[PDB]
Amino acid sequence: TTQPALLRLSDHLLANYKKGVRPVRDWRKPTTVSIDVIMYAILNVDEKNQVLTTYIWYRQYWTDEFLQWTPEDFDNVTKLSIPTDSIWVPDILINEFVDVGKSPNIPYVYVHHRGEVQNYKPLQLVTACSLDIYNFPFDVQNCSLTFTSWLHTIQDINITLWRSPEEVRSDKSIFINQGEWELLEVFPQFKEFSIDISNSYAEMKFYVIIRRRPLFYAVSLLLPSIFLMVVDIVGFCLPPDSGERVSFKITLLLGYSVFLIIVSDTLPATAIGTPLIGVYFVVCMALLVISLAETIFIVRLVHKQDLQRPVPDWLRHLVLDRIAWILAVRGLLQELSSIRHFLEKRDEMREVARDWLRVGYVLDRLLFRIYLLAVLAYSITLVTLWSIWHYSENL
Amino acid sequence: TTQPALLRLSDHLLANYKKGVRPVRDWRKPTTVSIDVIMYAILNVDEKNQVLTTYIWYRQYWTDEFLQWTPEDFDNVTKLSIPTDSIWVPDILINEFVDVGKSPNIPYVYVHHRGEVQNYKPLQLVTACSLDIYNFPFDVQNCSLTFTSWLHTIQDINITLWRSPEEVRSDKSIFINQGEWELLEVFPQFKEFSIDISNSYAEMKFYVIIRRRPLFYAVSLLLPSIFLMVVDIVGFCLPPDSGERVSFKITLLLGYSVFLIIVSDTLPATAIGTPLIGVYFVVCMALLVISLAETIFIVRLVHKQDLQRPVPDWLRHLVLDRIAWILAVRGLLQELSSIRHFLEKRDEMREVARDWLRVGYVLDRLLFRIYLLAVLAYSITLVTLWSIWHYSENL
Amino acid sequence: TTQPALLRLSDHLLANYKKGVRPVRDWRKPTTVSIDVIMYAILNVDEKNQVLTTYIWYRQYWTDEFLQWTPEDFDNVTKLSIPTDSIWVPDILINEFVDVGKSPNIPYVYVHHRGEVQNYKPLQLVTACSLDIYNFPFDVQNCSLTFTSWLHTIQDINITLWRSPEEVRSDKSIFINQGEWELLEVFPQFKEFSIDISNSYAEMKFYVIIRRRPLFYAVSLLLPSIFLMVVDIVGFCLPPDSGERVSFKITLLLGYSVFLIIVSDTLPATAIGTPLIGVYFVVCMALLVISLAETIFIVRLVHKQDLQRPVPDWLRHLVLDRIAWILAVRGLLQELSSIRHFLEKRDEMREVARDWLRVGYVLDRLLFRIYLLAVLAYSITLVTLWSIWHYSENL
Amino acid sequence: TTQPALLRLSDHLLANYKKGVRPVRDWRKPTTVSIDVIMYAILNVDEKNQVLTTYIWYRQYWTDEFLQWTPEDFDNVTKLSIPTDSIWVPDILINEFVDVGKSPNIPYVYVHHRGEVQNYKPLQLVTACSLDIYNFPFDVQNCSLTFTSWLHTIQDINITLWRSPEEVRSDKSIFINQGEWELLEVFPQFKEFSIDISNSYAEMKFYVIIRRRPLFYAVSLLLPSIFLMVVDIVGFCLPPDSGERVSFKITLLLGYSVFLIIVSDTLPATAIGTPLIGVYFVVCMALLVISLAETIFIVRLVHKQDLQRPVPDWLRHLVLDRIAWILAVRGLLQELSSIRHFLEKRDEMREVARDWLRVGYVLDRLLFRIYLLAVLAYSITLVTLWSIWHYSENL
Amino acid sequence: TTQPALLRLSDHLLANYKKGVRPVRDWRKPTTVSIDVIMYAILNVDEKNQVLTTYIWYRQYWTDEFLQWTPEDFDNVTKLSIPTDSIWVPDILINEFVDVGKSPNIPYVYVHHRGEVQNYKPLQLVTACSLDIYNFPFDVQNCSLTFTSWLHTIQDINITLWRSPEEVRSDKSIFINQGEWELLEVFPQFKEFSIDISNSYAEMKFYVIIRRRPLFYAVSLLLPSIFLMVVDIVGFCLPPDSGERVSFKITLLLGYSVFLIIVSDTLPATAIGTPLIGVYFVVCMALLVISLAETIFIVRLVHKQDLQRPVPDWLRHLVLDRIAWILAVRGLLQELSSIRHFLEKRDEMREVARDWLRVGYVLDRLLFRIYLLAVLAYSITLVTLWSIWHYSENL
Numbered sequence A, B, C, D, E: 001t002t003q004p005a006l007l008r009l010s011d012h013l014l015a016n017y018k019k020g021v022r023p024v025r026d027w028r029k030p031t032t033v034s035i036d037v038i039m040y041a042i043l044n045v046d047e048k049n050q051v052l053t054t055y056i057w058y059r060q061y062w063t064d065e066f067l068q069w070t071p072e073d074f075d076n077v078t079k080l081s082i083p084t085d086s087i088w089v090p091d092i093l094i095n096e097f098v099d100v101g102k103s104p105n106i107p108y109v110y111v112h113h114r115g116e117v118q119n120y121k122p123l124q125l126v127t128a129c130s131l132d133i134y135n136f137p138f139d140v141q142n143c144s145l146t147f148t149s150w151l152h153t154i155q156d157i158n159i160t161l162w163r164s165p166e167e168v169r170s171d172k173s174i175f176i177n178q179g180e181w182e183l184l185e186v187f188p189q190f191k192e193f194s195i196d197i198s199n200s201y202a203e204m205k206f207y208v209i210i211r212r213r214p215l216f217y218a219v220s221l222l223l224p225s226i227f228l229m230v231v232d233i234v235g236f237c238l239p240p241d242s243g244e245r246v247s248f249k250i251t252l253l254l255g256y257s258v259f260l261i262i263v264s265d266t267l268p269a270t271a272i273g274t275p276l277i278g279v280y281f282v283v284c285m286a287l288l289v290i291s292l293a294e295t296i297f298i299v300r301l302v303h304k305q306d307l308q309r310p311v312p313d314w315l316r317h318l319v320l321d322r323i324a325w326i327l328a329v330r331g332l333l334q335e336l337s338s339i340r341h342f343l344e345k346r347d348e349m350r351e352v353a354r355d356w357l358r359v360g361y362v363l364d365r366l367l368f369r370i371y372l373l374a375v376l377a378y379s380i381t382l383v384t385l386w387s388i389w390h391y392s393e394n395l
């Protein structure tokens, strides 16, 4: 028997090992597969249709009972590499998968004596995760990965873990911290999945916690919003000169409204979408629009000869609002006296025109008070969100 | 015969089972496959080209007659797992499929004694469904899934059901209610599909009813439309000051017209597309445009020296419209008397200019009445649609 | 021989049938394949790069001569199902294909006695068709599908038809009439394709006629164009008040020019692209632009002190254009007489200013006549196109 | 031996023909493969990342020496069809390939007596070609296709040609002239590719010449540019009325600037991108912008009380520029004499205001001369490019 | 033994060579694979999600010990081509891979006497690289390619290099210099990758250095920015005529703001994105916006009757700012004397109105000084970046 050790061991082991039979000697005992998953990177988190792209490394060992050999005979060999198509491989397939594939297959597997069979493989998974667009700048996502056997039951395949849960929870020795997402926790759990009154199935759920790094996003979205909160600072105190005022706003109401389009284009729009900023930015504009509507109505009322409607209706309006906020010489002298009346009529109009500019100069201050309350509330909401974002990582 | 039970059973059963033969002993009796489908999630409903993406779980059992064995001999075994490439698998393929695939294959199947053969598999299907864009905010879609054998006839393969129709109709124990679509009914039906005068085929149609969750869509599309229905409230009562009016509209007619582009971009445009809102929003603008055209024509007519055309033609126009809506001192006194005529001519023009501002102040009220009728009709249509949406789920 | 009939027939037939040999007994006679195609739906017609997506059903029968058996022996069997990888399958591949695939393979085929071999399969084809963008609203496309053997010649494989051409021409019993395209005719033809002076090849061409359903497209593109043809109705008769006129157009020349962008975005742009509407809509704007240029030049000429250039050059211009369209008291009286000259000079300017507003009021009518001729021609062209569209289906 | 001729020939030939051995009897002589390529269509020419999509037909013959038979024995057979997986196929793979595939495989090949082995197959190739965006409207592209054996050397596989180069150069009998590209020349060449000092490899390069059909592109891009070159014709001769002028340009500087966005969107943007039109259209606007800046500065200088700076600095500026272009009655008469001075002061301002409007009326003519020189140069460049485009096809 | 040499050698060698066994005779010695990589082109560098597309050529040799033969016997043969599926191929797979594939497989490999086994193959790789958007116009990217065995350890497979590192570092004999990226260095390194306390793995890292060719990008982005830095040159010295000024800016603040959208669209936006230009262009606009806000506030203060607030508060404001920058005849004469007071009142207002236009004419110069400092800093930053870009290639 002048043959190499590896060739003689491969000939002896795979001579009659038929694939298809669950490898076990008594059908009573189930076979156990133990798994391990380590994260490498996060490629894409698309919020339009709840798609998460992940890359992981993997490892699965299962005891075997038709590949036992004594190392004393075959020249002290203790580990062999065999093709993956010549033995039995369990159908451990992850759930919540969309277009699974895009990952090569490893054509070799290890085997030890007694049946310790190991396998290493990469998985590039496109999964379905319920992403919450709420708290957009500082979101904390909680995604799930479900490993189970698609066919076998609890009394056929049981899934345990290689290493303990703790050492699995904190594992960032391979992950690259260059993307826009950062790992927090990979928590494993095991339970049983039964739907009808007949079959019992194993199940292992990995909960993956991710945070978003928002420093760069903030400086490109918030800073322009805080800088554009000087428009109220600019247009202030000009009811008589509301021609210039209206000028100002008629162009400002479009200057940021034109890029509101590109802002909404840059938002990862979600059908179930209600961001805190995306509703404050809307009511901010609504309030500004109604303020300008009130100012235009006031200047239209006071610009004409209406004289703020001196009928007692405006008294009632003011009262309700206050409750709410709780022979030749004959011709000579004739011509002399004729023009004095016209001059007096010309001169009398100035005070009458200028006496009706107080209502706008009063109500603009209340509108500005409402605006300051709104921006203070917005800042408080932003501060407490950032506080929640910072305190989310203490656990 | 010192061999394991599973290996000896696999050797005995698959020794001479040739694949290809329909498994039956008398060609007269047909084989029956029974199916079951459970929904998991809805990934995409693209209305541009009638594409529906669905994920389901599946289950198919077929009686077999060359895999019968007695459990008394082979150590009380009652269920075995065998490779899927060593036996006969029916070609149950769903119709209305586009780019079917993207789903793994399960390499194992169960077998019981007597021939009970089972199979579990996931299907990710991209189907063609006739989606109705009408009733966009609150649509109720009715899609169809057709299972049949692509080759075999009614006397070769018959498709029945595992569980009864009722228990199949109400099955939401696995479905995730996080997307923008919500399951209502999965109704199964069975019939025969024959086109020529020769072949008879089995057919099972699953009708799937889906609704759209429109709360988030409403607050992002309707609320701005209701808020922008204050433009008529702002521009009111100013025929003499139609310079400011025209100012107002010339900018409002673009302020929402510029984002009408992004609105139309966000609509899932369909060739066969006529949404109730998408036609009301158009006639709303048309009516506003023609109202502004009438006001501009009126102010152009009354601004010049035409004096609303005092010829009797305007009497006829008003009548038809009413039917429609059913030595030195000599020079001294001379110079004194010369300027009085010029002053009188200057002063007489004011009343003549101000006496022709009534026609616009009358017709704007009728235009506003038409506008109020339009918005009331729009609100009534929205209310009855929401009522239909709410009452669609009582069945 | 206590064996089932099907297993014994499969063992007898496929025992020595080697695949690869054209199934025939004398190499002289060629084998004939007969095909049949039925349309299901049209998924996409992309005009950017001449891509047509179609789904069809299929059917091909070929006589066989190594699978003959007598039904008297094998228990009165007359039809058998055999795997598709164990027999000879012709390489009938369609031409004009791009990324062909995306369609499953049927693993079974029928066989009768004497050699009648049948096969059913679906084909999802992405073909290259020369689409004419001309007559965009109402196009009638004529696409081609070419079936031939990629390798074999006329004396090896001949392609005939299952059913007659007539019954093939009118076949809409399966087609779904929910899309934007509607079937008209599926005409089959057979001929020979030879390019060099040596090989002769069979060829079957199916001509497919499709029409577009333009009702929904019309109401979304034409109706706004007809509604926006009121701009000339609005801006009419105002040469002295050309400040307001210029106001009007300077904003109208952008109001539809801003969404012209989105219009051109919505057009399926084709390199070889010259739609009748897409050239009329351009010359429509050109004519309007040159009309406004003429009006602005006229008002600039008449606004200043040029007084329409009273030099005899304008006489020549008008003639050529007409051819084209075929001690104290001393100071007292002094001061009295000094101001009368200034008053007369002030009063004399009004008639001189108002006497030069006729040329624009004359040429605007000619410009409007040209505009009415243009819109009448546009309406006539639209009417005759729709007439061609309606009369295209009488055949 | 009562067997069919084809079955007996297939049994005799493929009985012991092992695949893998280069088919030759003396390892010294190399085997020669002869190829032929015929073009069908051009699907896509993407200039963003240098991707060319092509479809071709193909043909390759190689002498064989283990499939020789005498036609006298096997019933006068001279041509046989054999599966492509049972014989030796050379690894002739094209270089410069990206995502090669998307094309079916032909499962049969011809064989003659003596070893003449033929093969026909379609190839759909996505190649990398250096496309020059320069001369965009009328480009002449020169792409390369490189056929070589990926493994074998010059003394193992040599690649010659089926037909001569001339008959290969002019081959448009199958090509469809409906796209935006038109074939000019398919020139074959053969040489040797060696990089190190050890291996020698065969290489066949097909140079493919393509032109663009620009008639439709011209009418959609140039005609609007020539039509919009009337803006200088419109705004001419109005320094005093520069309010209307500034009005005009402030809106024209945006009227085409707003669709400049969509123009740049429609350009196939290339990183290495410098089109002749794309630089002329930019300098055209730059020149117009600086002209308007000069006019606005001039009108701002002459509008105020600066009076074109009558200090001798403007003399130096003009000189340098010219070098560059090479008791009661007492009160009565008092009041009479008081107002005459005010009237004279009022009347004297008109000539002083009107005497400073010449500098703009002089410099605008020079600016227009520069503009005319620019447009004449642009037209000359366009004419000579079209001349180059027309003369490129004379070869 | 009248057989060809190649057929007899193939029969002798592959007669009993079982695949799967690592080819070695004593399990103690490991097998060594030596690799070589040569770059061809760079197809895509997408900065949105860190994707790098590369094309390389490859070469791997491994000693074999079951394919030794003596050339004396088998007719002086020294090199043979054998199928790649009949021997042992190591699983050398690159790390950092996304959707690896898209590249054909070579079905043949070389073998020499003694076991020298060679293989050539192309790889089209989509890898994940951390691209730095900082220094956008002139970036120097440093990407990594990691070759290792996915399964085998250091004592099973060791990876060395064919040629030395130097000759590998400088290799541009095949690379095409037509794209937007240019090769600088391909540096190889070898080390060991161990994560736990048990397994030791080989690892070869190729560092690839790429630069961007920014000439064409510069002329399309910078030149417009330098040309648009004349807006401050145009609007200068006009506090009284701030109506025209405000006119100017209200349109300039939108003229480039409208294409800022398309600028941001053309930027390859990265979540971690902070380009030097992209922050200078923002603060440039911020500074201009606040300058215009100050000017509008100043002109609003000085336009009304406030008279720059002559209360001593403005003295304190100026001081703090300076610290910061460190019977008939009776009626006759009566009427004569009445109008003189009105004339004096009319004439006195001019000097009072004109005496308050100095503060804006002073502060605009300081604002322009800040603007000049900003643009000088921007130019200095651009110059030093280009200097870094030029000096990066000296190594």
Ligand SMILES: O=C1c2cccc3[nH]nc(c23)CCN1[C@H]1CC2CCN(CC2)C1
Pocket (backbone or CB within 6 Å): A095, A148, A149, A150, A151, A193, A195, A196, A201, B036, B037, B038, B057, B058, B059, B120
């Ligand atoms: O799809 C099903 C399924 C499909 C159709 C009808 C059904 N009735 N009851 C079940 C079921 C539960 C079994 N399953 C799978 C559930 C999990 C766990 C293990 N395995 C894969 C995923 C099995």
Ligand SMILES: O=C1c2cccc3[nH]nc(c23)CCN1[C@H]1CC2CCN(CC2)C1
Pocket (backbone or CB within 6 Å): D095, D148, D149, D150, D151, D193, D195, D196, D201, E036, E037, E038, E057, E058, E059, E120
């Ligand atoms: O990739 C290589 C190659 C790869 C790595 C190191 C190398 N050093 N020297 C070469 C080389 C030249 C050989 N080739 C191919 C070149 C052409 C011609 C034939 N064949 C395919 C394409 C072989």
Ligand SMILES: O=C1c2cccc3[nH]nc(c23)CCN1[C@H]1CC2CCN(CC2)C1
Pocket (backbone or CB within 6 Å): A036, A037, A038, A057, A058, A059, A120, E095, E148, E149, E150, E151, E193, E195, E196, E201
């Ligand atoms: O994925 C793993 C891996 C997966 C799961 C748990 C693990 N614990 N420890 C390791 C590991 C290290 C081994 N690897 C691979 C690491 C590199 C080097 C060689 N090979 C491929 C890539 C092996």
